[PDB]
Design a protein around this nucleic acid. Structure first.
Ligand SMILES: [Mg+2]
Ligand SMILES: [Mg+2]
Ligand SMILES: [Mg+2]
Ligand SMILES: [Mg+2]
Ligand SMILES: [Mg+2]
Ligand SMILES: [Mg+2]
Ligand SMILES: [Mg+2]
Ligand SMILES: [Mg+2]
Ligand SMILES: [Mg+2]
Ligand SMILES: [Mg+2]
Ligand SMILES: [Mg+2]
Ligand SMILES: [Mg+2]
Ligand SMILES: [Mg+2]
Ligand SMILES: [Mg+2]
Ligand SMILES: [Mg+2]
Ligand SMILES: [Mg+2]
Ligand SMILES: [Mg+2]
Ligand SMILES: [Mg+2]
Ligand SMILES: [Mg+2]
Ligand SMILES: [Mg+2]
Ligand SMILES: [Mg+2]
Ligand SMILES: [Mg+2]
Ligand SMILES: [Mg+2]
Ligand SMILES: [Mg+2]
Ligand SMILES: [Mg+2]
Ligand SMILES: [Mg+2]
Ligand SMILES: [Mg+2]
Ligand SMILES: [Mg+2]
Ligand SMILES: [Mg+2]
Ligand SMILES: [Mg+2]
Ligand SMILES: [Mg+2]
Ligand SMILES: [Mg+2]
Ligand SMILES: [Mg+2]
Ligand SMILES: [Mg+2]
Ligand SMILES: [Mg+2]
Ligand SMILES: [Mg+2]
Ligand SMILES: [Mg+2]
Ligand SMILES: [Mg+2]
Ligand SMILES: [Mg+2]
Ligand SMILES: [Mg+2]
Ligand SMILES: [Mg+2]
Ligand SMILES: [Mg+2]
Ligand SMILES: [Mg+2]
Ligand SMILES: [Mg+2]
Ligand SMILES: [Mg+2]
Ligand SMILES: [Mg+2]
Ligand SMILES: [Mg+2]
Ligand SMILES: [Mg+2]
Ligand SMILES: [Mg+2]
Ligand SMILES: [Mg+2]
Ligand SMILES: [Mg+2]
Ligand SMILES: [Mg+2]
Ligand SMILES: [Mg+2]
Ligand SMILES: [Mg+2]
Ligand SMILES: [Mg+2]
Ligand SMILES: [Mg+2]
Ligand SMILES: [Mg+2]
Ligand SMILES: [Mg+2]
Ligand SMILES: [Mg+2]
Length: 349
RNA sequence: GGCCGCAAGGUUAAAACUCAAAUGAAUUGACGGGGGCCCGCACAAGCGGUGGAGCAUGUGGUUUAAUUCGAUGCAACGCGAAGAACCUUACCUGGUCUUGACAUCCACGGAAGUUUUCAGAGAUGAGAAUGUGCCUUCGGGAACCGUGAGACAGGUGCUGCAU
RNA sequence: AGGGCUACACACGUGCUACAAUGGCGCAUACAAAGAGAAGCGACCUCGCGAGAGCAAGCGGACCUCAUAAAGUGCGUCGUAGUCCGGAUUGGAGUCUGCAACUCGACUCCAUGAAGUCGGAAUCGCUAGUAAUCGUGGAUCAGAAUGCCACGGUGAAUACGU
RNA sequence: GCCCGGAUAGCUCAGUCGGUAGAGCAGGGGAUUGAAAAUCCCCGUGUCCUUGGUUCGAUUCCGAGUCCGGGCACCA
RNA sequence: AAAUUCUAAUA
RNA sequence: AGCCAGGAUGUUGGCUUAGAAGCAGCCAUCAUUUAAAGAAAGCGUAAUAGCUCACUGGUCGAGUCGGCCUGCGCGGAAGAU
RNA sequence: GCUCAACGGAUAAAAGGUACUCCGGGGAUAACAGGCUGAUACCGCCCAAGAGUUCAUAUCGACGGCGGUGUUUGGCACCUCGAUGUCGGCUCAUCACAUCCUGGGGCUGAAGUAGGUCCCAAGGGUAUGGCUGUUCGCCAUUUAAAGUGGUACGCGAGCUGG
């Protein structure tokens, strides 16, 4: 019980705050809200109270800054550190009131041709170095070589802890402006690469052939069989009530063989049905976050002539391009989160 | 669509849409697996090497806190470097300073120097003796030291595709 | 202040030393040019197996010092062996410069004695005192060249031709 | 359901007659090229489908299984 | 006797 | 078994969380006063609250409450002239 | 001197079609229907992990267990081979109840209107068309509802003949 006392101290306000709100009889007219308060617990009250506490403390911290001729170093440092600490604490306690599994990383060439492939190789090397200096694992699922340099198209899987929550922001277009290595003259060229980041989902399968949701019809066959065929129920038809799929078999002389093989055909025919839907959902997701590598839609730019890297989503410009290219891209992704979760403080209604 | 033909097809003959040009002759080069005439250790004739081995040295890649920066077809790679244990040093870890290590300006107190001790990895900090004189209308100015404030100094930071 | 630029599964360029008898070793003994030197070059003598130590003349130099050239010639031995070829790596004991040789200097002595038996596809330099081979000096610099820049000794083969 | 055949390198395929596994393409390095192919030189392959047994010893011989290809499933 | 190719920003 | 009375004390518990306060699920179950009362067996609540039950007193006042071995019966037990 | 291995060995020497078929026999032996059985099928019940905010039993019921019926597919080969005409439709029916509608009740997570599930009840009632030879099924539009089964899977000395 290292920090259970903080939980009890939080308990000791809603322990009687909740009473006048459970029976206030303003949030009960609609059916959903009563059980929302019952199950979703006590988010609104304690979160608003903790927001007010944060606002008061931040108001306290701002003051006491216009003073000179005194050793204002360590007390100012500790005051701003407490400001940032409470800021992060309230940030998390209000964002929470997840998705931190493994990831798939795909990069492929956009405008440029061979130069795009070379930049794809460079970009993949950057991501691999970043993963390597995190005790993560990279495994090459698929590769398509680019005759001159790197990869037309590379798919890898990155394994670790909390991988997705860091790399989900790299999906989009990346623009590179530089003098290509495949170019006789000395011309600057602008080209692009396209990146997609996917979460790793569970892939369970269920044989939904539970007899409680089947209907079997037994009847006569048709064709030439003599007198035994007329007076016998050798033809089977199975229909699946949920999915509405019907399979009929009368190929053999025996009802049992017909029922068995028609049941197998029904199983295969139903399994393909959800395989196709899963494939199409995944393809639509990829097409939506992937983009058309076209140097006009892009998330960031790398300018090698001026040694500059810029992120257009947050309008940030650093002049540390070679550190970026050496797998130290955390400085490009830490501020992004701060902007992203800067929306989460507003998203409360 | 019409006419002609056994057929293959012939003859008559548009529109939407799209581009800002398409084209002719001649001029100067460059190029040709076009033609002539020449040259160069360029081939041919020779002699000795390199590619294999061990070591010296530079580069790429990989590693690292850093492995400083630049040259990188011929025309970069015993190159800048005619010489990295400290220094050089521009890189890394850690410890320190803020008109300041290097200059001019203003004011204040001080010959400059020379010996020490203590603490510290050192930078640095604290104390004590030591001498306080030199051209100077005895107005002192002046060599050089500490402190105080800002005009500033400082940059081996970026662009050789601004020079 | 300390560390790093000297890292090391790997690949490339430029060099040095060899794989031996036109040689290795031992003894004896002839023939150069060019250059540097005052916080410098340092003789003679004594000590040390040696790297060096001590004392100490001469020299701002056609005068003193570095500083005995080597390949070469005479005699002996080895007799085709991974060897009396080769000298990498490692262990022990030291010298010098420098405040300071652990990372990371050079040299000396004792011990050790690796790959290597003339090098695939490919590729380079040289037309005469030149290629090939043997020594000597200088700048940088307290110390630290197999690199760079210079100097001499011995001394070829070949060019029908385009 | 019955009968026959097959499972060998990253991919398509040879081969054992009980002690020992190959070929083409692909792969790694180096050459040539201003550079990429074509070309040239050097180099590495696998628990011979799974499982039980006989045997000194099983890819091989003998039972069962899984998957794959083929032929049959007729008289009413 | 052989013998392929050189994207996209200086004009 | 009836018929009357009591049927208590700090545990809004810390234990899981706003809630588990006797009563959804997670450890524990001491102690006090008493003739007696369980850190709660049940109902009932969102926590509540309350209503019971165990235990102990009072009238009545004669038997009473469960298992084991066996004999015979009951349900489970719906079809086509 | 025989894998005369069909191993008491038919000849030294030998494969198929018949829906164009024919004869002698068999219910000693199959296909339709009856019979016995009940693996399969359909219908009930037992225990209660769980799901249902709480809560096993309003409504469902995991892993397992116990029965009924004689509608399906079968197993057997007891009747019929000196003949028991076989699918669907038409006409005409009759019975069981495991009840589709109407009637009467209990419990509901039953406010009312509408539902869920179970108990009693067999009096009467319980569609027309498109497609297909269809039984089965899908579709259109109705109805209080368009029940489930037995009767040689009723019914050709009553019709038809897809
Ligand atoms: Mg037939
Ligand atoms: Mg025409
Ligand atoms: Mg014709
Ligand atoms: Mg023209
Ligand atoms: Mg023209
Ligand atoms: Mg020409
Ligand atoms: Mg020409
Ligand atoms: Mg030649
Ligand atoms: Mg070599
Ligand atoms: Mg470098
Ligand atoms: Mg440059
Ligand atoms: Mg050179
Ligand atoms: Mg240094
Ligand atoms: Mg230029
Ligand atoms: Mg440039
Ligand atoms: Mg210039
Ligand atoms: Mg230093
Ligand atoms: Mg270096
Ligand atoms: Mg001189
Ligand atoms: Mg030899
Ligand atoms: Mg030897
Ligand atoms: Mg020797
Ligand atoms: Mg020795
Ligand atoms: Mg010449
Ligand atoms: Mg010479
Ligand atoms: Mg290769
Ligand atoms: Mg050709
Ligand atoms: Mg092409
Ligand atoms: Mg072009
Ligand atoms: Mg009974
Ligand atoms: Mg009984
Ligand atoms: Mg009857
Ligand atoms: Mg016989
Ligand atoms: Mg016999
Ligand atoms: Mg016999
Ligand atoms: Mg029968
Ligand atoms: Mg539950
Ligand atoms: Mg029957
Ligand atoms: Mg019979
Ligand atoms: Mg029989
Ligand atoms: Mg019989
Ligand atoms: Mg019998
Ligand atoms: Mg009969
Ligand atoms: Mg008869
Ligand atoms: Mg008969
Ligand atoms: Mg008769
Ligand atoms: Mg009857
Ligand atoms: Mg009934
Ligand atoms: Mg009824
Ligand atoms: Mg009812
Ligand atoms: Mg009836
Ligand atoms: Mg009736
Ligand atoms: Mg009746
Ligand atoms: Mg009646
Ligand atoms: Mg009546
Ligand atoms: Mg019927
Ligand atoms: Mg009938
Ligand atoms: Mg009759
Ligand atoms: Mg007919």
């Amino acid at each position: 019980k290292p920090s259970i006392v903080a939980k009890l101290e939080a308990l000791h306000e809603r322990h009687e705050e909740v009473q006048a709100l459970l029976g206030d009889a303003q949030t009960i007219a609609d059916q959903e809200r009563f059980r929302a308060l019952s199950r979703e617990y006590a988010q609104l009250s304690d979160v608003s109270r903790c927001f007010t506490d944060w606002q008061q403390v931040q108001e306290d911290i701002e003051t006491a800054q216009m003073m000179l001729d005194d050793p204002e170093m360590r007390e100012m440092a500790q005051d701003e550190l407490r400001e940032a600490k409470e800021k992060s604490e309230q940030l998390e306690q209000q964002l929470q009131v997840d998705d931190e599994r493994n990831a798939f990383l795909e990069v492929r060439a956009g405008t440029g041709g061979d130069e795009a492939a070379l930049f794809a190789g460079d970009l993949f090397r950057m991501y691999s170095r970043y993963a390597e200096a995190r005790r993560w694992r990279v495994e090459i699922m698929s590769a398509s070589e680019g005759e001159h340099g790197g990869y037309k198209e590379i798919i890898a899987k990155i394994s670790g802890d909390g991988v997705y929550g860091r790399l989900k922001f790299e999906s989009g277009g990346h623009r590179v402006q530089r003098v290509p290595a495949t170019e006789s003259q000395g011309r600057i060229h602008t080209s692009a690469c396209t990146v997609a980041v996917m979460p790793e989902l569970p892939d369970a399968e269920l044989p939904d052939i539970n007899p409680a949701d089947l209907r079997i019809d037994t009847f006569r066959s048709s064709g030439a069989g003599g007198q035994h065929v007329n007076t016998t129920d050798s033809a089977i038809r199975i229909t699946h009530l949920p999915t509405g799929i019907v399979v009929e078999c009368q190929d053999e002389r025996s009802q049992h063989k017909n029922k068995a093989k028609a049941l197998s055909v029904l199983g295969a025919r139903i399994h393909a049905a959800e395989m196709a839907k899963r494939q199409q959902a995944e393809a639509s997701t990829r097409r939506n976050l992937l983009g058309s590598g076209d140097r006009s839609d892009r998330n960031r730019t790398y300018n090698f002539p001026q040694g500059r890297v810029t992120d257009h989503r947050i309008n940030l410009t650093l002049y540390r391009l070679d550190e970026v290219m050496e797998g130290k891209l955390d400085m490009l992704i830490e501020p992004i989160i701060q902007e992203h979760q800067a929306d989460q403080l507003a998203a409360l209604s």
